[PDB]
């Protein structure tokens, strides 16, 4: 039972922190280093082997042309691996799946229109993998700002024809419309540090004006994202990956 999630997005958006938050919500609090290479972190949780693929952020160069190619390369490498092991010569009953089933795309909360780089990046990934749009560091927005920006992001994904998951043509539609039009993009806060609020140990960030709680729906939507990818839509993510994306890959070969 393998499930593989990738995080991608501009450097400094809290991708690695959210990776740790995902695992920890499911005992030291050391500083998280800037990510230099693509690394697959796997832990066993019925029993599910959850692997999260951390990636070096992009967009930190003067010229960011073709910066998506390392990510595309990794994704295609897992397809090629699965393709080659499908021919189960070893006669194994179960075949290991390292294919990216889900890609969280981190969007910086600028309050303005989506950046051409992100639009191009998402356009590329959307045709090879399931992408889920996430607004990073949601604590940097007020309530009013966040509502406006979520609406703006939805509109701009729509006008640019970015087919993020759940792709409309794969539906349930009552639940999904709620997802595409209300739940997404998930505005998240990450932290693998714990604090005490009203007696409860909670994952959060401690500011001079208050404590931001990661799993508190009054503060952010990390809980909704986690539930979505780990519980309610996990099998569906795997199904679209195998039957649509991987088959698209297989045919292109
Ligand atoms: N305000 C805020 N800061 C956050 C949040 N998550 C992480 N940070 C902080 O943002 C900084 C960068 O986090 P990091 O997880 O390393 O980002 P990254 O996207 O992995 N960077 P890279 O792609 O270079 O490896 C750290 O100081 C971290 O504590 C968040 O939700 N809100
Ligand atoms: Mg990182």
Curated annotation (Swiss-Prot):
Upregulating conditions: Up-regulated during neuronal differentiation.
Region of interest (G4 motif), residue spans: 136-139
Stretches the record annotates as G3 motif: 54-57
A GO biological process held by the record: protein localization
Domain Septin-type G: start-end pairs: 1-253
Predominant location: cytoplasm
Binding-site positions, GTP: 9-16, 35, 137-145, 190, 205
Chain intervals for the UniProt region annotation (G1 motif): 9-16
Gene Ontology CC: cell division site; microtubule cytoskeleton; presynapse; septin complex; septin ring
Organs and tissues of expression: Brain-specific.
Molecular function GO terms recorded: GTP binding; GTPase activity; identical protein binding; molecular adaptor activity
Subcellular location: Cytoplasm; Cytoplasm, Cytoskeleton; Synapse
UniProt keyword terms in alphabetical order: Cell cycle, Cell division, Cytoplasm, Cytoskeleton, GTP-binding, Nucleotide-binding, Phosphoprotein, Synapse
PTM statement from Swiss-Prot or TrEMBL: Phosphorylated by PKG on serine residues.
Function description: Filament-forming cytoskeletal GTPase. May play a role in cytokinesis (Potential).
Family: Belongs to the TRAFAC class TrmE-Era-EngA-EngB-Septin-like GTPase superfamily. Septin GTPase family.
Assembly and oligomerization: Septins polymerize into heterooligomeric protein complexes that form filaments, and can associate with cellular membranes, actin filaments and microtubules. GTPase activity is required for filament formation.
Full protein name: Neuronal-specific septin-3
Source organism: Homo sapiens
Gene: SEPTIN3
Shown part of the complete sequence: 60 to 328 of 358
